[PDB]
Design a protein around this ligand. Structure first.
Ligand SMILES: [Ca+2]
Ligand SMILES: [Ca+2]
Ligand SMILES: [Ca+2]
Ligand SMILES: [Ca+2]
Ligand SMILES: [Ca+2]
Length: 212
């Protein structure tokens, strides 16, 4: 038999299982862990959940090629993706790992729910600390970013927007001499040019005000 085993990097590798009905200890031993280490073993269910495998919990491998996350750790943190609970043996999780676990398509935007301010957008390489109190909740939305042009909010479909295209979409003639200054939240306004590129992924809604 064969199984696929990965770690916090989620890079699966083939492992040979000589028993069709192993328990957590056998899966841990086949993955290269001594009995005293007791790694955390998480079986990837077909629906999308992760089932914790005890050292004496027999797993039926005759079904199909099952996948496991075997990470030497002494704890597990619970988080959620769209209300579905998931388990993670490490306290720091990257956005890429969240997308891998939740099977979120790359055409969507990942957010971390907050109550005291706007929900935080999580990039691929951004690290979220799960050790914070409470269950961290993640959300998938449509990949659209808002921009406040002349006091009106327009919803672009790209993380980065050319200022000329933004003005064109707003309706103003880009060819006129404009004093363009951007006002990112929490930062002073910075003058820009008609042909510059604005990254909307910064937290909050940017304000692209124009004057003649
Ligand atoms: Ca057995
Ligand atoms: Ca179990
Ligand atoms: Ca919120
Ligand atoms: Ca937490
Ligand atoms: Ca923004």
């Amino acid at each position: 038999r064969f199984i696929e085993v990965a770690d916090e990097t989620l890079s699966f590798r083939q492992v040979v299982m000589e028993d069709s009905t192993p328990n957590g200890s056998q899966i841990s031993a086949a993955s290269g862990f001594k009995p005293d280490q007791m790694p955390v073993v998480l079986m990837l269910l077909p629906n999308g959940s992760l089932e914790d495998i005890r050292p004496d919990e027999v797993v039926d491998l005759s079904s199909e090629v099952r996948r496991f996350i075997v990470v030497e750790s002494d704890r597990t943190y619970f988080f959620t993706i769209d209300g579905a609970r998931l388990e993670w043996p490490c306290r720091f999780i990257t956005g890429y790992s969240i997308r891998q676990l939740g099977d979120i398509g790359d055409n969507k935007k990942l957010l971390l729910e907050r109550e005291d301010e706007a929900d935080l957008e999580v990039q691929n390489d951004q690290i979220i600390d799960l050790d914070g109190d409470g269950i961290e909740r993640f959300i998938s939305r449509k990949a659209t970013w808002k921009l406040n042009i002349q006091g009106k909010e327009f919803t672009f479909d790209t993380p980065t927007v050319v200022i000329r295209d933004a003005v064109i979409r707003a309706g103003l003639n880009p060819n006129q001499a404009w004093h363009i200054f951007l006002k990112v939240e929490g930062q002073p306004k910075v003058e820009k040019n008609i042909d510059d590129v604005i990254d909307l992924r910064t937290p909050g809604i940017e304000k692209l005000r124009l004057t003649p």
